[PDB]
């Protein structure tokens, strides 16, 4: 359950969650659209579903894919801005969960963001530890889908 | 074009924009929840375009309408966050307008949202000339619409 997942954002990984978001939600532009690229390059099968954002291979230049991505990343600031109540974090989750639920995504490719997160992650020098606990945190809009 | 409109948003405007975010995008929770409940009070007619978000008339215990309520401020930070780039501002302009073309939300319906804004400022005691500048704000996406 969304609930049961929630339960194991504990203390130490929120830490984690924060101290590393500082470091990546400071380049919204930069890296969410580094976020989406290697998702694509990566798991090519996902490429169909973003049909309406046109050539996705144009990168920073497609400014459908550029409006997307900083978008994604004001998802993950909402996420972060809400680990301290985890009633409202849930809400937010069930509402993102919705907008991919109408898109036919499921858990498991919604889960196929986590290697490129560990890719972005270490590219700032945030090893598996970070990682790891940004993986929980998607397992909790997993937990909607 | 809503790069136009973007392009004329002046230093004066941006500040007061800034400013005035700076208190009601404090509490995302409360001011979101805040704005559309006094939509729904004063425009009874937009009631029917969410009835994805269940009996509205619940509040802040409608756990939807808090998730659409936080998110929304979201976007609204998202705006503020990107005044500086008209390029950026644009793109992610037309992002949230394509959710709303979606719906049918034609320009004038999204200007509706100006009342309910002119409320909240004035509730923070921000006056007429804030609620001018975020009127310039909601033009830039009513550009798109
Ligand atoms: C960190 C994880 C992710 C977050 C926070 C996230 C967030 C978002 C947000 C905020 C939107 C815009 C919603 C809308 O306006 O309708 C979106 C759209 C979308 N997402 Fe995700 N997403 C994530 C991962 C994924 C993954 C892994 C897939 C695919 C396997 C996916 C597929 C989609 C699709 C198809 C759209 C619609 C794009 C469009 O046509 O505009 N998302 N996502
Ligand atoms: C400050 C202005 C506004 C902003 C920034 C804004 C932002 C948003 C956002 C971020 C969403 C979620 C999009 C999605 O996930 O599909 C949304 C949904 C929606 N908006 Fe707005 N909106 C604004 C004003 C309005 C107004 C005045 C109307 C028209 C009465 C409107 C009608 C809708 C509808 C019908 C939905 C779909 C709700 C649902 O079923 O989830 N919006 N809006």
Redesign the interface.
């Known amino acids: 359950s969304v609930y049961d997942a929630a339960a194991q954002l504990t203390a130490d990984v929120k830490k984690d969650l924060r101290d590393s978001w500082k470091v990546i939600g400071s380049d ?2 930069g890296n969410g659209v580094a976020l989406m690229t290697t998702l694509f390059a990566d798991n090519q099968e996902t490429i169909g579903y973003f049909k ?1 954002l046109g050539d996705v291979s144009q990168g920073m230049a497609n ?2 894919l ?3 991505s ?2 994604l990343m ?2 993950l ?2 996420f972060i ?2 680990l301290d109540n985890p ?2 974090l ?3 989750v ?3 969960a ?1 907008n991919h639920i109408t898109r036919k995504i499921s858990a498991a490719e919604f889960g196929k963001i986590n290697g490129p997160i560990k890719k972005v992650l270490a590219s700032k020098n945030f090893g598996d530890k970070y990682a790891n606990a940004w993986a929980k945190l998607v397992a909790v809009v997993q937990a909607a889908l």
Chains 1, 2 share one sequence.
């Open positions: 919204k532009k309406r400014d459908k550029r409006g997307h900083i978008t004001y998802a600031q909402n801005d809400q009633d409202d849930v809400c937010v069930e509402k993102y919705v």
